[PDB]
Design a protein around this ligand. Structure first.
Ligand SMILES: C[C@H]1OC(c2cccc(O)c2O)=N[C@@H]1C(=O)N(CCCNC(=O)c1cccc(O)c1O)CCCNC(=O)c1cccc(O)c1O
Ligand SMILES: [Cl-]
Ligand SMILES: [Fe+3]
Length: 174
């Protein structure tokens, strides 16, 4: 319970001209980074997928699907469009005990192969942040991964706080 501090928002770019319609669909967490994320060579992190669906009201219904304990687990929540396109906050924050704040900023994407998204939440008074490298496929070029590593580090994260989940087939195909 000691955390590297969330970076200031000025160190987190925002994708220009955000096309919310084009960001829809399944993305693969190809890379994971944040102040509560730890590399664990004993029990390495399995890849998971996060599906974004625009509703009529242009909120995202966001569903993450994870292979856990031999089953598929579904983490569902809503992203509400925020201050500027590419930026979001969390709907029904009341239903999450201890949660007082939640921010999403799409750092970059080209929509049809890769994306970088930054998350910042304050739960139980602790400030957590993470960056996810999203891939439309389960594998990305070494260039894009090093860019993920580089950017993670520009925000204070050491290497043991940067993770590339191992590709799996169960649950996240479909
Ligand atoms: C079944 C689990 O899978 C997920 C999950 C699955 C895919 C992507 C996510 O962002 C997820 O949170 N959440 C579930 C979960 O119970 N936890 C532990 C509970 C603490 N989380 C929360 O209180 C929470 C509340 C509202 C929205 C969220 O995204 C939240 O994480 C999650 C604890 C792990 N969280 C983090 O490492 C984290 C770190 C920084 C920022 C975040 O938004 C984070 O979720
Ligand atoms: Cl803790
Ligand atoms: Fe979360």
């Amino acid at each position: 319970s000691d955390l590297i501090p969330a970076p200031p928002l000025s160190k987190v770019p925002l994708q220009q001209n955000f096309q919310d319609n084009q960001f829809q669909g399944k993305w693969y967490v190809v890379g994971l980074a944040g102040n509560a994320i730890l590399r664990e060579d004993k029990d390495p992190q399995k890849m998971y997928a996060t599906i974004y669906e625009l509703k009529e009201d242009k909120s995202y219904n966001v569903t993450s699907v994870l292979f856990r304990k031999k089953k598929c687990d579904y983490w569902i929540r809503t992203f509400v469009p925020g201050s500027q396109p590419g930026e979001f906050t969390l709907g029904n924050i009341k239903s999450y005990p201890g949660l007082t704040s939640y921010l999403v900023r799409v750092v970059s994407t080209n929509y049809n192969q890769h994306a970088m998204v930054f998350f910042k939440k304050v739960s139980q008074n602790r400030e957590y942040f993470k960056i996810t490298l999203y891939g439309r496929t389960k594998e990305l070029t070494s260039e894009l991964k090093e860019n993920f590593i580089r950017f993670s580090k520009s925000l204070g994260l050491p290497e043991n706080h940067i993770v590339f989940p191992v590709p799996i087939d169960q649950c996240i195909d479909g």
